[PDB]
Amino acid sequence: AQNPNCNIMIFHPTKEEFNDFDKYIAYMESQGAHRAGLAKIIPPKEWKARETYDNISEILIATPLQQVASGRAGVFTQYHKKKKAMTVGEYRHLANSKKYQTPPHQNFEDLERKYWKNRIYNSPIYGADISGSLFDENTKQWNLGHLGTIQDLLEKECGVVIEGVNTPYLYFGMWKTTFAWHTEDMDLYSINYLHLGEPKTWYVVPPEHGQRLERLARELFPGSSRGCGAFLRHKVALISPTVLKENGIPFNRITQEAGEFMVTFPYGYHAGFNHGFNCAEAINFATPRWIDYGKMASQCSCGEARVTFSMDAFVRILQPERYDLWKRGQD
Ligand SMILES: O=C(O)CNC(=O)C(=O)O
Ligand SMILES: [Mg+2]
Ligand code: NI
Ligand SMILES: [Zn+2]
């Protein structure tokens, strides 16, 4: 078995190897990359996502989210308070302000220490989940707005023809902006490209051990657990590496820098934070190996997780028993 310790793997495809996206994903899995839940892909030196970022300040963040924390430094939840719209130019200036900027630090480890020590005492503002793309249309390789769709994968593998679309989303981050512990909708893959700015630190639990993280989360967030049988779908809970180590949960960590891709694999729980002002683009995708994960994915039916139009069809076809109850939650 390849990668039996479930380490995060880092790939350096050549420009030739970067032509066929599906083939490269299948290659990485042949080497065991999926066992980690997360992989890094460094693009060939010749590749570029677009020519410059020189004109991005005019993108609108219609609903910036202030991420307010509750709990203790290592075990907290966050709630998203909606703020007034602002442009990316306004948000970047805010991120660079004295109130919100990255503190002085020695290296990524010192910054990680400061994040876990101090996150809860601040409320950074995150521009999340903004439909759009920063890939140039002329970028033919690993262009996250040109991937094969999940609906087309389900049709090729299973013959079924469904409604729905699959488009990318932009994320504008600042110091301390945080992504809570989650897997993807329907336990899909994700791919995330850091277009510019400061790094993103990731934490990940191997898929084969995801239930260990779930059981700890039920112990640490016991009222949330009684409220919903899949409350990590709410994407609000944080647990620090120190707490994960104290409780024996297997995990890995890695820092993504500008110009790099990350892939998350089906049922790979992940969480993380931004080091400073940045912009990422991410989208869900599927392969044949996902189908079985989609069939087994948990679902939030309490009504809090409230997800896309396109997820309806996935539930309806892969999980017809759940359909009914999950749509009671979504209506
Ligand atoms: O970058 C972020 O804030 C969160 N992204 C993801 O969880 C992802 O790409 O799957
Ligand atoms: Mg612009
Ligand atoms: Ni994710
Ligand atoms: Zn729920």
From Swiss-Prot:
Residues that hold Zn(2+) according to the record: 228, 234, 300, 302
Cofactor: how bound: Binds 1 Fe(2+) ion per subunit.
Catalytic reactions of this protein: N(6),N(6),N(6)-trimethyl-L-lysyl(9)-[histone H3] + 2 2-oxoglutarate + 2 O2 = N(6)-methyl-L-lysyl(9)-[histone H3] + 2 formaldehyde + 2 succinate + 2 CO2
Modification comment: Ubiquitinated via 'Lys-63'-linked ubiquitin chains. Deubiquitinated by USP14 with the help of TRIM14 leading to stabilization.
GO cellular component, one term: nucleoplasm
The protein's enzyme class: oxidoreductase
Modification PolyADP-ribosyl glutamic acid occurs at: 16-17
EC number of the protein: 1.14.11.66
Major localization listed first in the record, in broad terms: nucleus
Annotated ranges, domain JmjN: 8-50
GO molecular function: chromatin DNA binding; damaged DNA binding; histone demethylase activity; histone H3K9 demethylase activity; histone H3K9me2/H3K9me3 demethylase activity; metal ion binding
Domain called JmjC: residue spans: 136-302
Sequence positions that bind Fe cation: 182, 184, 270
Annotated binding of 2-oxoglutarate, by residue: 126, 192, 200, 235
Cofactor: Fe(2+)
Protein family per UniProt: Belongs to the JHDM3 histone demethylase family.
Function according to Swiss-Prot or TrEMBL: Histone demethylase that specifically demethylates 'Lys-9' of histone H3, thereby playing a central role in histone code. Does not demethylate histone H3 'Lys-4', H3 'Lys-27', H3 'Lys-36' nor H4 'Lys-20'. Demethylates both di- and trimethylated H3 'Lys-9' residue, while it has no activity on monomethylated residues. Demethylation of Lys residue generates formaldehyde and succinate.
Protein name according to UniProt: Lysine-specific demethylase 4D
Whole sequence portion shown: 11 to 341 of 523
